[PDB]
Scaffold this active site. Structure first.
Site, PDB file in Angstrom:
ATOM      1  N   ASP A   1       0.754  -1.267   0.000  1.00 53.16           N
ATOM      2  CA  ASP A   1       0.000   0.000   0.000  1.00 53.16           C
ATOM      3  C   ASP A   1       0.770   1.294   0.000  1.00 53.16           C
ATOM      4  O   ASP A   1       0.245   2.319  -0.416  1.00 53.16           O
ATOM      5  CB  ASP A   1      -0.966   0.083   1.200  1.00 53.16           C
ATOM      6  CG  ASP A   1      -1.730  -1.212   1.457  1.00 53.16           C
ATOM      7  OD1 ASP A   1      -2.753  -1.440   0.792  1.00 53.16           O
ATOM      8  OD2 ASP A   1      -1.324  -1.999   2.342  1.00 53.16           O
TER       9      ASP A   1
ATOM     10  N   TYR B   1     -13.059  -2.894  -1.328  1.00 54.12           N
ATOM     11  CA  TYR B   1     -13.595  -1.623  -0.883  1.00 54.12           C
ATOM     12  C   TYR B   1     -14.810  -1.257  -1.716  1.00 54.12           C
ATOM     13  O   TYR B   1     -14.888  -1.614  -2.868  1.00 54.12           O
ATOM     14  CB  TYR B   1     -12.535  -0.524  -1.004  1.00 54.12           C
ATOM     15  CG  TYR B   1     -11.399  -0.590   0.010  1.00 54.12           C
ATOM     16  CD1 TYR B   1     -11.068  -1.784   0.655  1.00 54.12           C
ATOM     17  CD2 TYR B   1     -10.664   0.559   0.332  1.00 54.12           C
ATOM     18  CE1 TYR B   1     -10.034  -1.831   1.600  1.00 54.12           C
ATOM     19  CE2 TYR B   1      -9.636   0.525   1.271  1.00 54.12           C
ATOM     20  CZ  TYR B   1      -9.331  -0.669   1.905  1.00 54.12           C
ATOM     21  OH  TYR B   1      -8.364  -0.695   2.880  1.00 54.12           O
TER      22      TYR B   1
END
Ligand SMILES: CC(=O)Nc1ccc(C(=O)O)cc1NC(N)N
Ligand SMILES: CC(=O)Nc1ccc(C(=O)O)cc1NC(N)N
Ligand SMILES: CC(=O)Nc1ccc(C(=O)O)cc1NC(N)N
Ligand SMILES: CC(=O)Nc1ccc(C(=O)O)cc1NC(N)N
Ligand SMILES: *[C@@H]1O[C@H](CO)[C@@H](O)[C@H](O)[C@H]1NC(C)=O
Ligand SMILES: *[C@@H]1O[C@H](CO)[C@@H](O)[C@H](O)[C@H]1NC(C)=O
Ligand SMILES: *[C@@H]1O[C@H](CO)[C@@H](O)[C@H](O)[C@H]1NC(C)=O
Ligand SMILES: *[C@@H]1O[C@H](CO)[C@@H](O)[C@H](O)[C@H]1NC(C)=O
Ligand SMILES: [Ca+2]
Ligand SMILES: [Ca+2]
Ligand SMILES: [Ca+2]
Ligand SMILES: [Ca+2]
Ligand SMILES: [Ca+2]
Lengths: 390, 390, 390, 390
Positions: free
Chosen positions: D73, D333
């Site tokens: 990330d 998500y």
């Protein structure tokens, strides 16, 4: 119609932070499906509505088959190209403005002024283009590689100024400034002062009355010629920066050139363009400069600052403000530009990070960009991510 | 709404300089990731806000697999394409206007008029398109390859003129002019004078009262038919240029066609489109022309000039003004166009530089562009940079 | 704000000529560097300022690796895509509007209305989108493959009409029309008359008072259901065209279905969408139709015309006007649209030319386009140029 | 000038339907000719004239050679990129906004506000950009990975609110909200209530007086922290949603956390961002939420609804409304956004569908989008179509 652009006060802030990186070659693998243009000497210039990313392509892409010659600076194929700031400079994405192996560009509030230089070495030519039309040219006065800024020209109330220089890279190169207006040159400005060698000037408005530049002196000194141009009287004078924090490359230890500010010191044959930019406040002037991290090679890049003072006579080392690029990464030409925000100007510094893997392969650049944002200290550095064997 | 375009005085200048080169195939290597369209007969036409680069693609790209046929001129796949001047003409970048194997285009101040020709040889058709809509057509009068300019049409106050020609490439081809207006043809103009063969006219406004052209005569002479069209009375007459500097290819030694201006001389079977453009001054007319450097082959390209005089009766050789392309580089169709600047017109010359490596591979073109800029002499030539074995 | 669009009189002309071809796969070789989208059911719709090219992509490109399934019509990947008319429909060039395996679109003078259909077969859904926003839906009434036009919807004074149909491909499919307005459905129109099977309607304005369509009847007849919709009273009736020149495929010899106009004749199981378009004149109505050249297969394509008359009761064969595609080339769905010119409408016919090389490879389409231009006879046909083994 | 944006009433509808899918990797085969960017955390934000698709690219494309690291990330290469909603996010198509490994963006009615976070973990920084200019920053208060929404910020009358959070992913992370205005932060909002862990808030306007969010609690609970922000008094409070239909992942059986609404239950270490959006009616409030189909893994995705009620105190399970993604497909998500239509807002839910095939290859995402459309039940699910071995 629109109005003429003028310099306003800088937006409030106190430190510089990493803002964007443009690394086209992250997308130039043989196995990939892209074609980023092979370039060098990139710079960024803005208008009231947008900033554009300029460069001098070698008219070839990666991957491609025309890599021989990419490492050299002048030829009949080189072109000044541009994309909007944020777009990857690719064959289709890019817009070719004119043939040129040296260039500048700036927006006057109304249209764009593109500058380009090309022709034989012993007699090159400065071509001026107003928007879509070719408007004027200017000839070689010293008959040895006429060349230009390699960063944005500055326009005030409709008049754009531009430094040009003719002469030996290893000897005398007296620069001159041009007051262009609407594509047409309307006045030459012969600088007074220490004029033995001034090239690749990085200029900006310290105010409405004065443009200032940190330039390169390629033969005589590690210090930087500092131009101050009075826009009221179109007169310009040059003297060496007095600071001990020498901003050129190669260069020796800081504060080791003994003598008055005007002392050159050892030649330290060579140079590099350096970013410089103004942070004008109501009652103060913030001057920012970049310098490579290595004294000898074009590796790494640091930010400096010095509010107020006369660059011409202040010996004080500049204040370090951060490492934008580390010594493990490439740090080549750097420049400054200003984004125009609704009510103020945001000063910035772009760093050309060059991929160089010998003269037996492609040679190109990435563009890192730090801008003035809020407070604190600069926090993070830039890497290119590019592996040249892909 | 906007206004109608008219010719203004040219921008001041005295010489021509290299401005831009568009070499799409610098990006068509097998190892590269691009797709420049395969084209020929390129030309450039401008409006008040921009110039566009037109061409007739063979509906195939490089690298690709449909190279057979690229070397020929007519077929059911050919299309008139365009990109904005400065963009590389690629599959995605380009906009397909209409099917056509011969064409022209011009902006009237309001919208664009695209012209295209296609259909059987013995009965082709001239298709006119106003902006987005197909507006009119015109049929074959001599039933042998109806064809058009291959460069921009000229519009004045809303009326655009356009030369069309029907007939044998090796015999009689009487041309006619069309006064189009808003997409619709409103008058045919049958030229008077020396009409035995006139094709590929390169036209422009010498003034508000007269359009003039330097055309090709493909069978009878090395001299060039010179059309003069009176816009007041929509009448046109043709006579051969009298100058000894013969502007066609193939051609013999200058001033060696003995006789009055009207003397054809040997056939010198063949021809080539030639750039021509006007530099209108308050009290003088500058006429510029290009010619290949080789008398026999389409190699190299030189610029000429002759202020004032009647092209119809002046024997004087034109004044040489520079080598835009050398004899080592390709010099094919050349044309003239004018960039519209805020207050004046900037005359220019584009040169189609063709890559030809036999009929057993791809065939396409590059576009070099010289425009009137400042003073001095033309300084530098154009090379394509393209290696056909990549 | 802008105004509402209405049908005006057609631009004057009398014949149709080849105008443009869009063959994306001319650029899909393995050795090439492009990615044209794999599509089918293409159509074109225009607004006052531009025409756009629509289609239903199979969400895969050529060359690529997702060819299995391309030959089928319905799945969860299919999307209605569009590019401006003249651009090649490629991954980057295209704009994805919505998920759909059947669709329509039309501009009302202000924004675009995109229609799309998707969902399970036994319960699909018609999704309406106003510009950027998803505005309304409509459900399956006959629970067997809800589907739509596959060509443009027609808007008049702000109200757009659209034919939808639910039912068995090989049995009963009663169509209904929708009066949409600003994204929202405001009235359903249940047609009266011969409603046993009407699908893929190609509709247009014969006047301000009436929309008319030539549709497909997939199970019962080779003749074409002809819808007439009264915009004044939002009522619609259907009857079979009486003409002996049967416009569907497969079909038998012309004038061989014995009986009144209402006689179906043999089933001739199957059908095809057919182009149809109006050429409204002050005191006359020109109706144009396309038909494949082969009675049995989707090869070739011819243009027909019949001024005035009641399609519902006139037995007279239509007048042949040209071969747009020959029997050696693919001729699939065809449609009609109208380009909006400054003062009149230019009627046109697009022909979907499908590349089909089995179900063990890619399946896609090219789009040929003929529009009304001047006079004479149609002169030239269209070829795709595409070789499927590249 | 334009006006400030405010929330209006939602467009009428009652169910959600599949609207669009953006699967860039359908075009990233080795044999294909495309270059979709490698991304994650995508979101969509709209203005009065258009919606844009945002994401955090790993500055590499498929196919390419920089796949190592794509699965992580944070790093110095990550950038917040965007394309218009409907365009495939590719190297050339995309616009790079700023360097950032966490971000948000929202349009205030006038220009765009882009948010980005980057810097060292122990001291990251929130960078704010107004349109083209870098305007402000905000520092790390808890010195452990400063981070932001990963979905759109919400602007009302010129003031945009934005949740930021600093702290351990596995411990304490108290979030704060920022009231930004025209690029500059003008107020911090310290939330009251249950503040031990609140991250990745998905926020929206329940009305002109209140913004509400469904956030992630990464260490202590499977329930979701629910923020309620009073725009009148810039005060915010947090409490856990009381509903038995737990919206996080991993999570246990519904209604199995025994105790008052405020009971955390077992930690269920981990979390996921979840879509949430408001459907404001004149006298009612519709709140929609997504949840993965699997209790433990990020597979599948379901839609829920509950009109009116206090999320803070209502135990009632939400009403199931459809399976947007099945358990065989990736569901990561999810977020909510609202398309602005002429007179009302159209609430929507985007689902990031991640391609994950280990850490020894590329890692990227597709974006599915469901919006409120008409009535009935949600009918069809979304698949990506992407095969990772191509
Ligand atoms: C015109 C030109 O040669 N531009 C250059 C580009 C790069 C470099 C370089 O330092 O890499 C040098 C030059 N020349 C000078 N005089 N600095
Ligand atoms: C229509 C057409 O054949 N155009 C041409 C293109 C190129 C060439 C050429 O000279 O290469 C010739 C022609 N024809 C004529 N008559 N000049
Ligand atoms: C929705 C749908 O299946 N569309 C089609 C597309 C092509 C074809 C075709 O004829 O190739 C057929 C259909 N279906 C019908 N009913 N004509
Ligand atoms: C900044 C950052 O690390 N963003 C993330 C992205 C993805 C994921 C993820 O859940 O895949 C997690 C994080 N971090 C937190 N705290 N949720
Ligand atoms: C220069 O003048 C204009 C206002 O006339 C404005 O840009 C600014 O106030 C002046 N420049 C500075 C740095 O103050
Ligand atoms: C033609 O007329 C207009 C002004 O009416 C202007 O373009 C120009 O003055 C005239 N042309 C020339 C070459 O002077
Ligand atoms: C329909 O009405 C408008 C004028 O009100 C115009 O488009 C046209 O005259 C009418 N349509 C036709 C076909 O005449
Ligand atoms: C908020 O105020 C404006 C009108 O002032 C408008 O957007 C709307 O009516 C209000 N919001 C809602 C949800 O009603
Ligand atoms: Ca030096
Ligand atoms: Ca591309
Ligand atoms: Ca000749
Ligand atoms: Ca049938
Ligand atoms: Ca949790």
């Amino acid at each position: 119609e629109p109005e003429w652009t003028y310099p306003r006060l800088s937006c409030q802030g106190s430190t510089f932070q990493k803002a964007l990186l443009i690394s086209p070659h992250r997308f130039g693998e043989i196995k990939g499906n892209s074609a980023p243009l092979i370039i060098r000497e990139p710079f960024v210039a803005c208008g009231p509505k947008e900033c554009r990313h300029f460069a001098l392509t070698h008219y070839a892409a990666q991957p491609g088959g025309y890599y021989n010659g990419t490492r050299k600076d002048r030829n009949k194929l080189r072109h000044l190209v541009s994309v909007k700031l944020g777009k990857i400079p690719t064959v289709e994405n890019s817009i070719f403005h004119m043939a040129a192996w040296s260039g500048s560009a700036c927006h006057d509030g109304r249209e764009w002024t593109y500058i380009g230089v090309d022709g034989p070495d012993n007699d090159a030519l400065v071509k001026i283009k107003y928007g879509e039309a070719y408007t004027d040219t200017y000839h070689s006065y010293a008959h040895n590689i006429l060349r230009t800024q390699e960063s944005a020209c500055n326009c005030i109330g409709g008049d754009c100024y531009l430094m040009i220089t003719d002469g030996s890279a290893s000897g005398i190169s007296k620069c001159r400034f041009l007051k262009i207006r609407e594509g047409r040159i309307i006045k030459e400005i012969l600088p007074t002062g220490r004029v033995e060698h001034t090239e690749e000037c990085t200029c900006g408005f310290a105010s409405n009355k004065t443009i200032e530049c940190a330039c390169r002196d390629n033969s005589y000194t590690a210090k930087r010629p500092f131009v101050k141009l009075n826009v009221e009287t179109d007169t310009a004078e040059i003297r060496l920066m007095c600071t001990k924090t020498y901003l050129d490359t190669p260069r020796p230890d800081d504060g080791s050139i003994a003598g008055p500010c005007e002392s050159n010191g050892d030649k330290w044959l060579g140079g590099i363009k350096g970013g410089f930019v103004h942070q004008r406040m109501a009652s103060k002037i913030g001057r920012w400069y970049s310098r490579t991290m290595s004294k000898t090679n074009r590796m790494g890049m640091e930010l400096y600052v010095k509010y107020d003072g006369d660059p011409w006579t202040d010996s004080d080392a500049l204040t370090l403000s951060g490492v934008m690029v580390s010594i493990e990464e490439p740090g080549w030409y750097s420049f400054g530009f200003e984004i125009k925000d609704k009510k103020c100007d945001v000063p910035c510094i772009g760093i050309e990070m060059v991929h160089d893997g010998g003269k037996d392969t492609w040679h190109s650049a990435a563009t890192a960009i730090y801008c003035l944002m809020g407070s604190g200290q600069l926090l993070w550095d830039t890497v290119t991510g590019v592996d040249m064997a892909l």
